[PDB]
Amino acid sequence: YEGKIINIGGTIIKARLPKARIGAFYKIEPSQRLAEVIAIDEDEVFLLPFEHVSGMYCGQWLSYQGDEFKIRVGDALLGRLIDGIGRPMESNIVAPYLPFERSLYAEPPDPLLRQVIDQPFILGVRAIDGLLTCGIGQRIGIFAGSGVGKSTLLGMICNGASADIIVLALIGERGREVNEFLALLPQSTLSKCVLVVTTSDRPALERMKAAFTATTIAEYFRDQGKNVLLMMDSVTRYARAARDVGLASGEPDVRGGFPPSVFSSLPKLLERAGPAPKGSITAIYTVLLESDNVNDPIGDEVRSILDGHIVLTRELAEENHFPAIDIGLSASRVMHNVVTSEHLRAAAECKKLIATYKNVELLIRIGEYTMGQDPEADKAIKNRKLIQNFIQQSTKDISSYEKTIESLFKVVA
Amino acid sequence: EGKIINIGGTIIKARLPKARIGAFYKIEPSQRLAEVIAIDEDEVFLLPFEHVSGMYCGQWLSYQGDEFKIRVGDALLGRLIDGIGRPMESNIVAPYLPFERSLYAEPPDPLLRQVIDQPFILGVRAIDGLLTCGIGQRIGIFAGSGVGKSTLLGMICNGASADIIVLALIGERGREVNEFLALLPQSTLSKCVLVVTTSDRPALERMKAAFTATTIAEYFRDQGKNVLLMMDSVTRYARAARDVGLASGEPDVRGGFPPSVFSSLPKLLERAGPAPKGSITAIYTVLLESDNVNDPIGDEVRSILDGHIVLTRELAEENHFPAIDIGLSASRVMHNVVTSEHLRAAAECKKLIATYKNVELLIRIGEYTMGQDPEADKAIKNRKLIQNFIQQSTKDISSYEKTIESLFKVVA
Amino acid sequence: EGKIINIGGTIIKARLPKARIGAFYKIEPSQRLAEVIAIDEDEVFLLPFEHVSGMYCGQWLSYQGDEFKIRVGDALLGRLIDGIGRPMESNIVAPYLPFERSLYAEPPDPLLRQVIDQPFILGVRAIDGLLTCGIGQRIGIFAGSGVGKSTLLGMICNGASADIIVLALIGERGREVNEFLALLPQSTLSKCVLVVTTSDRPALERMKAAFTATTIAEYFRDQGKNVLLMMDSVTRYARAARDVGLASGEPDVRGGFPPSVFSSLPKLLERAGPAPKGSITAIYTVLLESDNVNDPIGDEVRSILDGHIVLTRELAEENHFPAIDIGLSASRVMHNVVTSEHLRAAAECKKLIATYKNVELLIRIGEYTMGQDPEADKAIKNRKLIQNFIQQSTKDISSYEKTIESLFKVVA
Amino acid sequence: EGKIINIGGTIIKARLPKARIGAFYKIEPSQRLAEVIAIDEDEVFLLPFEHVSGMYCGQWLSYQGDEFKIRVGDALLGRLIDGIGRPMESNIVAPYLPFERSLYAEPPDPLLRQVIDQPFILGVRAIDGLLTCGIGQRIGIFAGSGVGKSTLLGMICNGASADIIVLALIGERGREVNEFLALLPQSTLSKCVLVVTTSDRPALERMKAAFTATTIAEYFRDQGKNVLLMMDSVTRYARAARDVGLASGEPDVRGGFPPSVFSSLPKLLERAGPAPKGSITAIYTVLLESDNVNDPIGDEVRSILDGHIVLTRELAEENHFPAIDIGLSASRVMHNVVTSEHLRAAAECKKLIATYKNVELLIRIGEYTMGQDPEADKAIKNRKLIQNFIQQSTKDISSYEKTIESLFKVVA
Ligand SMILES: Nc1ncnc2c1ncn2[C@@H]1O[C@H](COP(=O)(O)OP(=O)(O)O)[C@@H](O)[C@H]1O
Ligand SMILES: Nc1ncnc2c1ncn2[C@@H]1O[C@H](COP(=O)(O)OP(=O)(O)O)[C@@H](O)[C@H]1O
Ligand SMILES: Nc1ncnc2c1ncn2[C@@H]1O[C@H](COP(=O)(O)OP(=O)(O)O)[C@@H](O)[C@H]1O
Ligand SMILES: [Mg+2]
Ligand SMILES: [Mg+2]
Ligand SMILES: [Mg+2]
């Protein structure tokens, strides 16, 4: 009725329709599909469709629906799967009564009301609780290459950790995995868990807005006053989708691909999940790196945004050192507040023992090390197979927080 | 009805008013085909099905349908298919196929995938004992050029018992069609469809042949069969899509490639997996732009598939065949498939392989004294047993039971 | 017929309507031709055959034929052709060449090719023994500059015994025509066709010489006789196609090269090989842009040809001539054309060379004792035999039987 | 004529209708020529080199010729010529120079350019006895900085056996050219024709100095003499051509260099070889560095020339002048310009050089006893005579029969 699509191809369509707001969405009038206005020029506007672009033609009419895309949240979506758009995935069910219609884009808390985090958030993995340590309210990231340990360690964390609500966002990832995450979490955890699932075949928009859907649901269950655990698998899939949308809309190319929209819109998403006046969100974001280098565009940006980073190395997965986290290269920015002085000092001594062996390792292999002429090299060797049973852990094992402390005190001696 | 206004070398563009995207057209005097890929308000970019030599400005385009659909049916078993669905072998009669299928279908719904828990034996001892294939697992074979990819698919063509074998040979040597017909017996060739487009063929016909292989494998999946799909150098599809996507005016997001080859590789690889009715277990061969595993398409296909088998050139020069690097290889479902003593025997064997590659320069130069480290002596004493368990000739196939009993014997 | 509106150094833009792509035109005040590459509405982008340095704006184009066709006949034997197709011998009267045909031809059908199982005796002893070649395959010589490619083609040209030999010299040192013409006797020159372009010649004639050499070789193939196409530096064709593609407005995708180079190599290299009627055994040399085999164009030619002889500079400096590195090299038909104990002996001789290369540090500074590895003691005992087997001089030639019995002698 | 439309900083545009390409136009306020490089419809591109700042919108041009020409003649001996072709020494008058050559000629017909057969006498005992030059060989000396390039190069100037030497110095400074030409006497400046352009001159004149020296040496070839051309620093020819080609607007293909540099080096240094009348024996210089390792100009120059000399650094940090490392350097045309006994006596000395290198790094750690090998002990007894034969002072010139008999008394 209003405008006409004049340009079809790639990821974005372009239509002639005047007096368009930005962000408002539009039904393709003979086709039931609908599209969001992402960028406006004088009379031609860039739209981004929700579905496939095939089948369209020039002059196809474009009706009007709403001024902002909002999702529909409620208390009645625990234990239930949600799409990236906001719809429920499963069709066996009777549809819920979700009463509260929330906008997708919202504001972080005031920086003066976000209190200092000083309570440890127990995950269950011995390395990431003993050496590094989380806190109720931080947002930690898991940095790895392709197929190293990210989804296996996030499954261990979801198995071991406990929170009032658990929001788990499987964005950009293979469809085989939505049943493995429903398999390894129990019935009591499925009583309090919302999955937000977007497979990698889905369009740019669903794979781009599923992260904002999961963050909005976590903010809703925060505002009731509950400690909610957010877990987002491959936030770099959001980054790739924002890349190809922003490049198709005609933007420049800074820091290896990646328009300014990506690096300017990551903190508008990652700053929304932390401590708050009522409740808190403990977010865990996994990051895929374009090589094994940690110094990616997106890897370095997300490392400079978050509150702690767990870097997993492929060269430790070649040796079956699982979980493959690299202790010298990873860090946790709040463990000096959330734990006492004995644990922090013992963790410091164990980290320095690991780095000391990593310096001593190569000249043992080619056969030039001499015992006796260095007191702290031998101390890093005499303990080494004792510390590795603390630093590497089976998948079907959870560890208590007091066994972790006593194991670290026995290791560090 | 409209007329061509330029020819660019890869794609053409034309003055078609109000044309559908995806629709294909006949170039009216000379009997060829092209299809719409982009629209600029009256000027459509078209990708021709053939070579572009001979064309001129003002050449008409008659209309033929809204979608290039292939003619599929049950009489494809035992015969060879061109990259866009046509039969190749002119020696025999044209087959009769009843149904039409488009090349672009949706993956099965993620709630209906039913996590894979049954082993798929291959015949290679390294991808039985130390890696293990599930029925529904999609696997990749990552190597450089001439490292052993095709040799290993030839090993696991006559070793894997599946109901329908749909083999795609996109972007490779014309000489090989006969060699992959000289490794398959008639008890295998009677159930094997062999889709093949070679390196000569146009960029559309190497782009749109992996979709033909997946569509045929989905027709044989929906009947209820366990299909074994296997493609040769899916990076030839990736390079054809690079060429067309750069000719159509897209940027260069990573290592040479447009974003549309990164966003259209999952919606080909995600269709081959476990399903409610039937299953497709697929094996994708991936060529790397060097011997680095961190190629862009190598990295993306490693982050899509359910298992990667990395073959290195170093082991090929060492005459260690098949050249599988056990450290860089992984199978994402081995633990859901094998028994637990099998799993810990596999982990101990990979520990022994890594420990020998630690202590090898310590024993060769002469500093390793026999008795210092209580795992390196295990590795040294079991080196040759591990090595003739890992290596295998092309015409030797192993079963599952003999492989795991030799694994238990070698690892302890 | 049309004027010229742009002259750009390589691509000139004529304003002439209804022009067919592939057609060539004359610049009518002169006798120099130009071939159409791309078109627009009424502006065709075309490439001149000679250099561009004498042209002005309004300069007409007479129409010549719609495709560029060389004239081939049976009287090209013993002649000298350039990359356009003209004779170079002014001292000899021009022959009678009744047929004409275009330079762009499809390969044989992939099923009408056959599995090659007959050896091609080169004469070089190392290649014949350890690596070996089949009648109808495409071997490829990879080296640096000045490592010894050309010398090995001269050796392999005196030694081989094909019916017709079509030696192409593309983008090469003009001094060498008489040196490749002096190592041939008259008994081989009477059956050999020689196609010579030079590094001085422009980016079309250096680009079009490979296609005319392969067209002449396909003519003598279609007469039904085993021909031998030897091509000197096919990478000069790759450089010329890079310049033509980048002048025509193509993007870099890998190492400086456009997509059109990587799309135009496989059809050139894939029209040679087996055939229903005859065979065309091809030996291509590839100049790697440094002394490394992971050149973009070196890797893409290795992933097309079936077999590769990788020469190294570290052996050429140490007077290991010819400088074939036996570990880096391969031949994809070795297992198929020769007997089984020959395959076993060659495989463990290659393994013996590799296991000396992983020992010799223990010998140069004294860390090796005799009786702990009997294979290594046998290797150190037999190295003088083997480096009197791998090395041979240029005028040395050995038949196939003496090569096999010397291999059986050299590894016992 | 026409006037300047705009100046885009480096390249300028001017409306000259029906203006050819290659032509040179005269700016009307000053004495500054400029070159057309690309032609549009009625608005040609045009390239200034001297000075850009004092320019208008409306500054005029003036037509001179079809393209640029220089004045060659027999009275060029003992001169200094600019890269334009102007005589640099203004203290004398340019004599009756009657002939009129262009800068761009073709190399001879390769059938007429016949095999090079007789040795070129050079003077330096290393390049004359161990390696050997030829009459028509294009030697390229690879030097560092501080190895003794200019002193050796002056020995080549003075000790040569050629009728005319032609010297070009392409990128150099005034102290550098004066300290070079103050090393060779008036008896050598009688036959020499210096073509000097320095590192303050614009890049067009440094690019044209190579062509100017080549053309005047071809003129001295066509009247039947042995020309000895010496381009100093083709590295800086390549830097000048890179800067011109990038300023014209041309894509980077390899290491910072446009396609025009890589396609302009063969048509430069193929012109300097054997000929049907006379011959020109060329010797180029490339400056290799220690901050690069690839240096694409060094690789391309090594691919186009035939025979190269590597001047290493540590052969100068212990004062071994001339600093030629035999075994790292080689000449191709040696086996047909030397006799057989001189060939076998030359290979023996380089075998002894490599042999004492091996035995010396064996013995200086302490793993050698005197008495192992007679090739080692003959190397021991002949080291002082080898190092006495290779070492040659700045004033010492030897003949060729003395060189052969000194080689025969160093082979013993
Ligand atoms: N802690 C671990 N224990 C056992 N296996 C592991 C562990 N971490 C990684 N792996 C092995 O590595 C493979 C790939 O890990 P995955 O979690 O799928 O990577 P991604 O980070 O890409 O999702 C898994 O199949 C797994 O078997
Ligand atoms: N198991 C094996 N036994 C013997 N040779 C092998 C084996 N695996 C690889 N090769 C060698 O590698 C060659 C080329 O491998 P191929 O599979 O054709 O490479 P690509 O991966 O490029 O298709 C084989 O012809 C053979 O020479
Ligand atoms: N088999 C050999 N025996 C002795 N010398 C050789 C041999 N092969 C090459 N060489 C030396 O190497 C030089 C250059 O080899 P060539 O093949 O011309 O290099 P390119 O590969 O660049 O053409 C030759 O002049 C020759 O002296
Ligand atoms: Mg994952
Ligand atoms: Mg293959
Ligand atoms: Mg050569």
Author numbering:
A (entry chain D): 34 to 446
B (entry chain C), C (entry chain B), D (entry chain A): 35 to 446
Excerpt from the paper describing this PDB structure:
Substrate selection occurs in the cytoplasm and inner membrane, mediated by the export gate subcomplex (EscRSTUV in EPEC, and FliPQR, FlhB, FlhA in flagella) and the cytoplasmic ATPase complex (ATPase EscN, peripheral stalk EscL, and central stalk EscO; flagellar FliI, FliH and FliJ, respectively). The T3SS ATPase homologues are made distinct by their homohexameric construction, a presumed ancestral precursor to the heterohexameric rotary F1/V1-ATPases.
The EscN-EscO complex was subjected to single-particle cryo-EM, with 3D classification resulting in two primary classes that refined to high resolution. The EscN hexameric structure shows marked asymmetry, with a prominent cleft between chains NA and NF. The N-terminal domain is largely static between subunits, with approximate C6 symmetry around the pore axis. In four of the six EscN inter-subunit active sites, the Mg2+ADP-AlF3 transition state analogue was clearly visible; the resolution was insufficient to differentiate between AlF3 and AlF4, so AlF3 was used as the more abundant species at pH 7.530. The structure presented here shows that EscN can adopt similar C-terminal domain conformations; the lever is closed in nucleotide-bound sites T through D′, and open in nucleotide-free sites E and E′.
